[PDB]
């Protein structure tokens, strides 16, 4: 009876959560109007992990949709699975963050946060045993990068025991995206280091590469990107949602994947993954699933994992499979890619098995990876931060809405310490 409460913040967070509540309603048989059109009792056995019981046979998602603008909130309300949300946890502003961390954190983003904490407090005290919090947002935006981290800080202050995972969309390595992109990413990750328990870094160009090459889609589509991210989250929380041979919830994943407290930046994966015209042509065996999982070009955070070692690997398999093949496959990949794993931690693989695959597929498998290769992300972000910090560009907005050079340097030194400790644990030997 553990409970996870979802906290879509920003345009990116709202659009991602609108697909997340599509996938975990079609995995539970919940129609857009809110009833239960299911067949198995396993769907209704553990529906309280995400859905509060309403009057009649209705089920209401436990999600607080937060934005400083009404546009994407209206889009979520008008789209599919938009009438399933309660019309009270639609907290929205009338000004907008303007893609500014200062405007999200020390401006009217800090004015609506009182009502946001009131709604979160109500939806968290209307439970029996809260597992924790699930925040979806983007690092290079406004209220997702700003007010979202402020909400993280307030909740971490209020409940410093429960799990709090953040499916953060990381800005791309190429193109340009936002112009205050690395300022916002810097000031968000500085508060992500000491306030969250585990962070899933998701990269739009990695998703584009997967969509164009593996799925062979001519149009990449944000809906498809959010579908991939949503399937990743469903594969993360399927151990709480459904039974299995070897359960492993979010806290077990955090324990088995976080050696040191400031090392919780993960690289997610989900690799039952083929082009739509070649689905019936390809077998779905356990070794082939493992082969697609342990691939650098299937990764969803860029940051090529061959350029570094894996600290820990977690793998959650949804299907009716054999533990012998699963164990021998992880033993085989560990023995083969022995140089890509840290030697000071033996058996860097956590195995979870949930015997309920998602609808349609017959055996899925999702991938979480904590590795030293994520240090290239923060190295790049610090590179643009110091590049436009030595020129004093676009800092006038941050000083206008409140915050300034010293905590800018605090954030920059925080990422430098993070990069240095990642490099230290990459290059550290046994004896």
């Amino acid at each position: 009876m553990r409970e996870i409460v979802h906290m879509q913040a920003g345009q990116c967070g709202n659009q991602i959560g609108a697909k997340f509540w599509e996938v975990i309603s079609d995995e539970h048989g919940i129609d857009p109007t809110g009833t239960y059109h299911g067949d198995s009792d396993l769907q209704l056995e553990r529906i309280n992990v995400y859905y509060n019981e309403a009057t009649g046979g209705k089920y209401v998602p436990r999600a607080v949709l937060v934005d400083l603008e009404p546009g994407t909130m209206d889009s979520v309300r008008s789209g599919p699975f938009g009438q399933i949300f309660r019309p009270d946890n639609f907290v929205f502003g009338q000004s907008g963050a303007g893609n500014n961390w200062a405007k999200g954190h020390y401006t009217e983003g800090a004015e609506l946060v009182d009502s946001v904490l009131d709604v979160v407090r109500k939806e968290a005290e209307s439970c029996d045993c809260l597992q924790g919090f699930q925040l979806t947002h983007s690092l290079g935006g406004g209220t997702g990068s700003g007010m979202g981290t402020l909400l993280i800080s307030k909740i971490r202050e209020e409940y410093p025991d429960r799990i709090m995972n953040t499916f953060s969309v990381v800005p791309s390595p190429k193109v340009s995206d936002t112009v205050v992109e690395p300022y916002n990413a810097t000031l968000s990750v500085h508060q992500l280091v000491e306030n969250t328990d585990e962070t899933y870094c998701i990269d739009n160009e990695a998703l584009y590469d997967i969509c164009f090459r593996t799925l062979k889609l001519t149009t990449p589509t944000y809906g498809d990107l959010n579908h991939l991210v949503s399937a990743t989250m469903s594969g993360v929380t399927t151990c709480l949602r459904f039974p299995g041979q070897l359960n492993a919830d979010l806290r077990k994943l955090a324990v088995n994947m976080v050696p040191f407290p400031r090392l919780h930046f993960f690289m997610p994966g989900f690799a039952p993954l083929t082009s739509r015209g070649s689905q019936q042509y390809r077998a779905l065996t356990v070794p082939e699933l493992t082969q697609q999982m342990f691939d650098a070009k299937n990764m969803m955070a860029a940051c090529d994992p061959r350029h570094g070692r894996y600290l820990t690997v977690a793998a959650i398999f949804r299907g009716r499979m054999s533990m012998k093949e699963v164990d021998e496959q992880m033993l085989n990949v560990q023995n083969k890619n022995s140089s890509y794993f840290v030697e000071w931690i033996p058996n860097n693989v956590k195995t979870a098995v949930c015997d309920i695959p998602p609808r349609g597929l017959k055996m899925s498998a999702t991938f979480i990876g904590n590795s030293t290769a994520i240090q290239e992300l923060f190295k790049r972000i610090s590179e643009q931060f110091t590049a436009m910090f030595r020129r004093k560009a676009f800092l006038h907005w941050y000083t206008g809405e409140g915050m300034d050079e010293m905590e800018f340097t605090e954030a920059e030194s925080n990422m430098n310490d993070l990069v240095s400790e990642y490099q230290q644990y990459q290059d550290a030997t046994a004896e």
């Binding site: 010293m406 340097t409 030194s413 310490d417 400790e421």
Partner: peptide, 14 residues
């Protein structure tokens, strides 16, 4: 700001 960055860093480098 470089001297302050090297002053407040836990693991300073370069």
């Amino acid at each position: 700001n470089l001297m302050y960055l090297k002053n407040i860093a836990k693991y300073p480098q370069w």
